[PDB]
Design a protein around this ligand. Sequence first.
Ligand code: M14
Lengths: 404, 559
Amino acid sequence: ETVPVKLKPGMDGPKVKQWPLTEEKIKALVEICTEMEKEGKISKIGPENPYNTPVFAIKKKDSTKWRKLVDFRELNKRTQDFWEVQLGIPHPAGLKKKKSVTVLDVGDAYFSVPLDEDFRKYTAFTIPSINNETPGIRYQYNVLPQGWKGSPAIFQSSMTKILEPFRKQNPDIVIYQYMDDLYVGSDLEIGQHRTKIEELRQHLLRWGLTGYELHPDKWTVQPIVLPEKDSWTVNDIQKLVGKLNWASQIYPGIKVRQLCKLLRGTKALTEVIPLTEEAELELAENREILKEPVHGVYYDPSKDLIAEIQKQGQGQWTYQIYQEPFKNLKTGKYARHTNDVKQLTEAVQKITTESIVIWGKTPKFKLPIQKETWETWWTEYWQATWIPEWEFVNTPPLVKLWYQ
Amino acid sequence: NSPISPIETVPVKLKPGMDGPKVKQWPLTEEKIKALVEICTEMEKEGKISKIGPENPYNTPVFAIKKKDSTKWRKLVDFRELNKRTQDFWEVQLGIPHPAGLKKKKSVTVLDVGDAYFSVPLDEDFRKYTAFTIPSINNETPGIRYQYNVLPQGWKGSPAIFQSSMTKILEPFRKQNPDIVIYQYMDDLYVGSDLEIGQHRTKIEELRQHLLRWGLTTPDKKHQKEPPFLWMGYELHPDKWTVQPIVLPEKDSWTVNDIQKLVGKLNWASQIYPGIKVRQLCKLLRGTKALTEVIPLTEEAELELAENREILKEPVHGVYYDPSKDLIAEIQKQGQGQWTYQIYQEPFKNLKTGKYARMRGAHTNDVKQLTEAVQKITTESIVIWGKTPKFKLPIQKETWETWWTEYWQATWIPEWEFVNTPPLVKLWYQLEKEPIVGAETFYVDGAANRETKLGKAGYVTNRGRQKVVTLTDTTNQKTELQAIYLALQDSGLEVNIVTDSQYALGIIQAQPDQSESELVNQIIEQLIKKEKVYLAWVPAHKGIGGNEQVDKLVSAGIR
Ligand SMILES: N#Cc1cc(Cl)cc(Oc2cc(Cl)cc(OCC(=O)Nc3ccc(S(N)(=O)=O)cc3Cl)c2)c1
């Protein structure tokens, strides 16, 4: 029997354009799809289905088989009510406290279960052709698709059974399902951990479904770092109150007057100045306030999460996740044949998966890059099975240094 | 007449919430009613339409117009209402083939399908909504009443369902001929293979046959067209291609209409003729009076059109595509944010060409544009060939490396090589990383009043110098830039500058070399002239050394 699915009212199905794909990715998808057609997973469809959802080919960390990856960003928004406030999957707060988290692809699970016939149409997708030789090859799903948030929503109750024996036997283990993946965290020694996971893949294995190691407790701050130095220059002070100036607004108590008074009248930037004792009382005060969590800022579950990212050059990238601008939930850096787009890709994935472990939802990314470039290039490096939402921005001049 | 394919049918539907059309038939003249009656009885004889009683409640207007010249009448059906009630269909095609993406084939033949829509059936429970009525003389007699069985012209689903139906039919013939290319465009098929006339003409026959088993008729040899196929604006010879004759009007006085047409034509000429330029011409269009209004040619515009004329003397053609070789794309800076490109496979034998202009933003420099163009071309290559080209660009690997590295925005170009084809792409000034010992620090500020729209711009330096200019229709933004300009005019070869405007900081920090703003351009010449310039930012309204001082200076009277 099929759990019938409803669209969020008045609004209706996704009609997203399909991106041009290169010949190799097209072939790989033709292959993949011919095969899942033979297995009854998808079916050719007719003109009379006006829906569409983009499709791409990716790789995934070590592998030489292409994977199919369908972008259901649209669809997921149009079904937010079904998968989120109707079949919601509760995020366990404990997950972030474990010493190790392993991520397992559980996506092959969904192909067991058939999809409510009156919903299949919303899953339409198209394999394009080159130079428009031929019409795309259109298809839709007969089963729960990878990448649609409804799939684990529905599959939830079978997943509970698969794991019941294993949960019973390791009650200090946290397993959380987000989209196509399982998150498993334990406080065990690294050997016993890799062992428990080995053991958990047999339970999975007995039911069809057939890796990735995170360390969340060892995720620590990115403190807005001010310099330590002998011989402070006019400029350095300017920079200093600059950075400091902006640290207040989010950091409660940051003060500058002492520091500020240092520079008075109209003097050369290179002029060296002596740092009066009262000034150092701020540096210090500031320094300590500056290493700590914010105070005032709490995850509100009803609000969207934002992430902004800045290029710091020589292969490093800073970022901040927040809900109200400035009210920082988390800040971080990411560091690295590796170009900008490749790097920006790695970071987006890494922030997204942290964000998944911590809040059980993914951020909308502000991306310091031209749409078109990003859109043409992102899949060469993408490996995740989900896709976060993103927009394109023009990193402010100063935001860069202040998080430097 | 025109067989109606055995194939299965496409279950059409109407929009949720909506029933079929019920629109009143306007009273027609006798000749019109007659003509319609001849037409409708003929179509009915051929299976195209069918009689129904007045029990069916739906109706769609019919008309009949005669003809400019000949004496045959046409039936017209106003499908506006049914169209607005029919479900949406899938976007038929998304992109048309480009000649330069056409694989070079030994032989190709064109097969247009005769009476396309009429050769394919219509979902049975949908015929009913296609009801129309030939009326009688005046009112009296109930009209004659019909409904479609095939795909009606002018109905929303016809292009889609036809295309779908032709896909289904082609499938199995593709299967047992994987090495034969069949382009589907609308109601044409274009077929090419790498075989000697012999088994070509045969294979095509075998196709024609396969189609007919399926109710679709196509011309025989003798009726199929001969190359050069004039298709979709293009000319398609067996070993090259080109755009059809472009001929540029010689007139005393150009109307806006005359210029729009020209730009269209030159634009269309650009995909194979290199060097084509269009900016002097487009500028004329900005602001424009009537369509029938004469715009005098600018001197710079006369200069553009003339250069274009010399390109178009003597035709240029382009070649076809060989998938076993790479694509090379070469780009050249033509000038005023104008860029020109060529794709080829074998050196100087071009597949196509183009230009790029599109001002991305308000201020930019050549490295940014150069890379915008690479983006644009990369994308165009995926669409056409299914792969990106190897680039050859008039920018040194070092210029490029400096810029990508030090710039805040993420950047990437595919595979590229330098090529020494002036003008070379270069950055025209760098700012310092550190303040210039023994150079004068100017502190700059600007302020404007939100009502009067008046403003003051000035500076005070660390050598006692000072200045304040007044400005009459400004904004804060303009005053802040003005301030920085001032500071550059009176500053001599090495200045340190400090501002509280993130705005100007941003602009200048991106090494603009062109701008929409005269002021930003003035700033650019200064900066280029300078030897060392360092620029720095402080927050405002936190009494800071020089800043507190200019702030009050430029405030006086403004705020
Ligand atoms: N879109 C489109 C479109 C539109 C129309 Cl009207 C026709 C069309 O046919 C094609 C199809 C293909 Cl697979 C390649 C191609 O051009 C390159 C080529 O090799 N041509 C070519 C080769 C031999 C001859 S002969 N000796 O048979 O006359 C004629 C020609 Cl054109 C042209 C494509």
